[PDB]
Homo-oligomer: A and B are copies of this chain.
Amino acid sequence: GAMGSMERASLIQKAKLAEQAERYEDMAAFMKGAVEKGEELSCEERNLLSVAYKNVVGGQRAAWRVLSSIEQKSNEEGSEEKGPEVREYREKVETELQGVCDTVLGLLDSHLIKEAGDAESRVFYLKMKGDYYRYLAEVATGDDKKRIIDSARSAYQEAMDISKKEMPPTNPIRLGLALNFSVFHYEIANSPEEAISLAKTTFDEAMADLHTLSEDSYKDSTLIMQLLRDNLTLWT
């Protein structure tokens, strides 16, 4: 890898600079380099990894949606035939997105998840695994689509099982996992009732535990609780 000659600490330093400069492709490359040094990541370092790739893949997903919408209108009744270009360029963006997802899943499999023994790190990485299989599922159409969906489900479920046993209901990782697994149910698994039930139960159980928290923990937890509520409002 092109980052093999840079110090781990220098990679982390430059990832933070890239974030400040909104250079998220660079940030992701720096953090990939840091993961490949082979040491476990701290909480702050896990957050840098997540932020970098979330921004990269988020932009790809937005672009894919623009192009997929144009392509679908191109195939409506009365649309003028315009050649292969829209499909080709949608496929180009799609292939780049799949490549990023495969890269992230590769980092989790080699070897972040297997070395993660603490509940907070293990749940964080398994949530990420669910998330990046979910992004692969958003664009999947072939023989392995159901298996891609189940790979997302299985990662999220393992993360949920650990988080329920080992973390309080207000823990931001537990909350963000539940938020995203709820979206998985609604948008990927065609299970809106499960999505709504999960979001509501997560919100209510967190509400009942807020009284245990400091002001700073309360701010962290209620931020994600508001995202649960926002989704419930969209869906009901």
Contact = CB atoms under 8 A, between A and B. Distances in A.
A67 B13 CA distance: 12
A49 to B, nearest CB: 18
Interface residues of A, number: 24
B85 A13 contact: yes
A78 interface: no
A21 B83 contact: no
A22 interface: yes
Given A17-B70, A67-B17, A70-B17, A23 B93 contact: yes
A85 to B, nearest CB: 5
A5 to B, nearest CB: 12
Copies of this chain in its oligomeric complex: 2
A189 interface: no
Contacts of A197: none
A45 to B, nearest CB: 16
Interface of A: 10, 13-14, 17-18, 20-23, 26, 59, 62-63, 66-67, 70, 82-83, 85-86, 88-89, 92-93
24 contacts: A10-B83, A10-B85, A13-B82, A13-B83, A13-B85, A14-B85, A14-B88, A14-B89, A17-B67, A17-B70, A17-B85, A18-B89, A20-B66, A20-B70, A21-B62, A21-B63, A21-B66, A21-B93, A22-B59, A22-B62, A22-B66, A23-B63, A23-B93, A26-B89
